[PDB]
Amino acid sequence: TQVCTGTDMKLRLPASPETHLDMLRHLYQGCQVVQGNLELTYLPTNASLSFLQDIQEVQGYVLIAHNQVRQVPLQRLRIVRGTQLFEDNYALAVLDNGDPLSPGGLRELQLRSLTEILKGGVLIQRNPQLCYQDTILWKDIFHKNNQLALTLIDTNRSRACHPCSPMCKGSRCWGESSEDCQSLTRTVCAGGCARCKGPLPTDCCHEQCAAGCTGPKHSDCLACLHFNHSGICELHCPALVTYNTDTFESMPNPEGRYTFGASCVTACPYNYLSTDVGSCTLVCPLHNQEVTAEDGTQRCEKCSKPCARVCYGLGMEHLREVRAVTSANIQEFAGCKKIFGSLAFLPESFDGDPASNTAPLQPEQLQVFETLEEITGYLYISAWPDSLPDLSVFQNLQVIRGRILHNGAYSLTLQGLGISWLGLRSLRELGSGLALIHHNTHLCFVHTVPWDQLFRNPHQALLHTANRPEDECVGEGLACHQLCARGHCWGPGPTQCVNCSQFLRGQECVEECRVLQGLPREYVNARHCLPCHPECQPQNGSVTCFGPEADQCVACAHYKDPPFCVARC
Amino acid sequence: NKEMRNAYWEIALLPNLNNQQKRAFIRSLYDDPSQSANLLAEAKKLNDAQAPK
Ligand SMILES: *[C@@H]1O[C@H](CO)[C@@H](O[C@@H]2O[C@H](CO)[C@@H](O)[C@H](O)[C@H]2NC(C)=O)[C@H](O)[C@H]1NC(C)=O
Ligand SMILES: *[C@@H]1O[C@H](CO)[C@@H](O)[C@H](O)[C@H]1NC(C)=O
Ligand SMILES: *[C@@H]1O[C@H](CO)[C@@H](O)[C@H](O)[C@H]1NC(C)=O
């Protein structure tokens, strides 16, 4: 996949340092367009970072902070759009990369392709080994309306810099090497030109081009200012529906497209919703209702009768601002099948808050979620009552969509918990986002889950560390039951398999049904043991009944009122 | 199926069992659900034995 979602933890320290690098790798490997922010923080001195080399565009902002590494391989980065800005100010923030009192710290920026910043400014501070930043003509990189973007640039160093290669147009470079000369694109143009590739008037770029070009065509852009319609840069995407003048009706345009990020698109990508207004979103607008197509596709549509009541999770509607699930809001989930939003359980969830007098949430109360089948956002658990050994309250939970992600990264997170197994036995999908399960000292059955089968795109993975050692779990007999197909389960015993090996009696995976023997006699159906009618007569060695009804027995225990068995005539 | 989830909550809520004990019972329950009646009584007998006095 060429496209990927960034992150959203800014200067916060990583939740799992042991996995942080590996996380980034899964996130940006081969990625070319970052929907959101590219945050690269706390990277250790010898860290291999080549997974970043394909990135050309960042929708959000770029943050390079608290790193020990000497270089960040971002030579291909062409355009940062600044859809969100760091501290609502900066499109690019390079902070505090240098040893905390041979030496480490970023040495050059080497963003030789960076020629367009649509929105926001630059902040470069406290980087003891950094060179050449004072050298760059920022106003050329800034978009025309951005000239005034604010630019706070610290220069204190702990080393002298070599001079920019004599080869550079000015004395302006992204580093020592001669490949590192800043190419100027906006300021060096013939007439009031937006972007150009050279001094000549015919070297001017197309009006729809963004960073620069290699020709006057809208098919020759280095980036699209607005939308990428299959190589062509355009103001809008070709609309979904055309009005026909010769029939006074609106038949759909076969050329119709959807606006995805900054690119036109045939249909929405996997976890996204298609709107009437022609876009791909992660949320429907007001008056709009989420509707699953007979296939699987999701869509927004207008409500015919004013939209029916719906359960809102944290981060949504009147819970937008709310941080955790507590006694104050637990009721709002009473018998919800689907939660529009997310759920977090923090320590404050479980030890209440006298300052608001919100009572500590009581284990039994967690039973409201027993019906829950779907979460559109994420699920975050950093505290869980020690009296519960697993997360079986979420036994019926099937999908976590991941349309909202904790720290813009994680769709499922379990840390510091003290549960012994998972028990999320219906969980079959993680729509998007990474999963993180760590520092749960007594936790088994992590390896036994087919994470592979649950994910949906290849930028997902399960990061895990510091749980219960695997061979410790087996010593204690905490592994998958005999009867679980392919050795996958969510926990101990035969009610925990992903797929059952033989037959199911309700939820329990069992070797044989009771066809030939056993107290209540059974018939079989789609690998499910099901009970013979109470009026049926049990058999020795032969079959007992052929279906649920009274006409399906081989003999009656009481009276025959053809074709049934009764206790009557 | 409802047989199980009740027993689970039943064991989890007994005031006088510590968590370790509650786990043992819940575990044995998940290992063989048919024993829910036997384990349930077993847990109640110990819960009453450890009643605060
Ligand atoms: C707009 O989209 C087109 C096509 O979807 C992009 O062209 C692809 O670019 C990648 C790497 O840059 C190549 O490996 C593919 O072979 C190209 N595909 C096609 C069909 O040509 C294009 O780069 C995008 N951006 C711009 C500014 O045009
Ligand atoms: C790799 O990193 C280590 C630890 O910081 C450092 O001591 C070493 O010099 C580095 N090795 C190489 C080959 O650059
Ligand atoms: C089958 O044999 C058992 C025990 O040997 C007996 O109790 C029962 O009556 C027999 N049932 C039938 C249908 O013959």
Side-chain angles (χ1 to χ4, degrees), chain A residues 251-521:
Chain A
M251 31 83 128
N253 192 7
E255 311 317 305
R257 291 294 176 275
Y258 288 97
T259 62
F260 184 58
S263 35
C264 300
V265 117
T266 303
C268 291
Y270 177 75
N271 210 8
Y272 287 70
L273 292 137
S274 14
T275 338
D276 274 341
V277 79
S279 62
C280 294
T281 63
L282 291 175
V283 169
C284 290
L286 183 77
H287 283 259
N288 266 25
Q289 185 181 248
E290 198 161 289
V291 282
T292 302
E294 303 91 336
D295 322 311
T297 339
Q298 294 256 52
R299 224 186 58 183
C300 300
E301 85 171 47
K302 270 160 273 189
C303 292
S304 298
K305 303 183 193 299
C307 318
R309 70 296 186 190
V310 101
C311 318
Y312 275 118
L314 311 182
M316 214 86 179
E317 222 242 354
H318 73 288
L319 291 173
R320 185 180 68 253
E321 281 311 289
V322 179
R323 46 193 282 85
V325 171
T326 61
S327 65
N329 52 22
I330 183 87
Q331 291 317 336
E332 312 183 24
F333 306 106
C336 290
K337 277 173 85 159
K338 164 151 170 176
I339 285 168
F340 282 89
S342 313
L343 303 169
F345 303 76
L346 287 15
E348 95 210 41
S349 278
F350 291 107
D351 27 281
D353 191 353
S356 285
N357 26 74
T358 79
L361 199 52
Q362 289 303 311
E364 53 278 52
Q365 277 177 290
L366 296 160
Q367 282 168 25
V368 277
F369 302 115
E370 291 212 326
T371 44
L372 181 67
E373 282 154 22
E374 172 169 13
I375 285 176
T376 62
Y378 63 82
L379 175 64
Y380 181 95
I381 312 176
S382 52
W384 195 252
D386 280 342
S387 56
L388 312 168
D390 64 343
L391 308 170
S392 47
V393 297
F394 291 117
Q395 225 181 27
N396 306 293
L397 171 62
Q398 299 172 23
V399 305
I400 304 176
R401 293 237 178 265
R403 295 190 183 118
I404 300 170
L405 303 170
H406 195 267
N407 296 312
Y410 300 103
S411 46
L412 180 74
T413 307
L414 324 164
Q415 79 177 209
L417 288 205
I419 48 162
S420 301
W421 60 88
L422 297 162
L424 310 172
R425 59 158 190 229
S426 311
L427 184 55
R428 56 170 171 74
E429 171 179 351
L430 289 175
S432 63
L434 280 140
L436 170 57
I437 287 169
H438 74 291
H439 295 290
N440 315 284
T441 294
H442 305 121
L443 184 65
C444 296
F445 292 104
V446 184
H447 191 222
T448 60
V449 173
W451 302 102
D452 184 73
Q453 277 171 24
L454 266 49
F455 305 130
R456 287 297 106 103
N457 81 80
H459 299 278
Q460 315 184 248
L462 184 267
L463 317 168
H464 59 92
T465 184
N467 300 298
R468 193 166 191 205
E470 229 261 333
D471 99 345
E472 221 164 84
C473 296
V474 319
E476 230 131 86
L478 284 162
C480 293
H481 197 268
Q482 283 243 72
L483 259 43
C484 309
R486 270 286 161 254
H488 303 305
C489 63
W490 292 92
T495 73
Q496 293 299 297
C497 318
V498 175
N499 278 293
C500 174
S501 218
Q502 298 297 322
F503 296 87
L504 287 148
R505 171 151 49 243
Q507 291 288 91
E508 192 192 321
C509 192
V510 299
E511 188 94 50
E512 296 297 315
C513 294
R514 288 149 186 169
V515 184
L516 305 178
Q517 73 159 144
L519 279 155
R521 292 287 176 85

Side-chain angles (χ1 to χ4, degrees), chain A residues 519-523 530-539 544-559 564-567:
Chain A
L519 279 155
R521 292 287 176 85
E522 286 154 339
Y523 74 95
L530 292 180
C532 292
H533 194 95
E535 290 308 300
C536 290
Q537 222 262 93
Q539 293 305 297
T544 306
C545 85
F546 307 96
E549 265 82 10
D551 31 286
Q552 269 113 110
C553 318
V554 59
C556 312
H558 295 282
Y559 300 95
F564 304 93
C565 305
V566 290

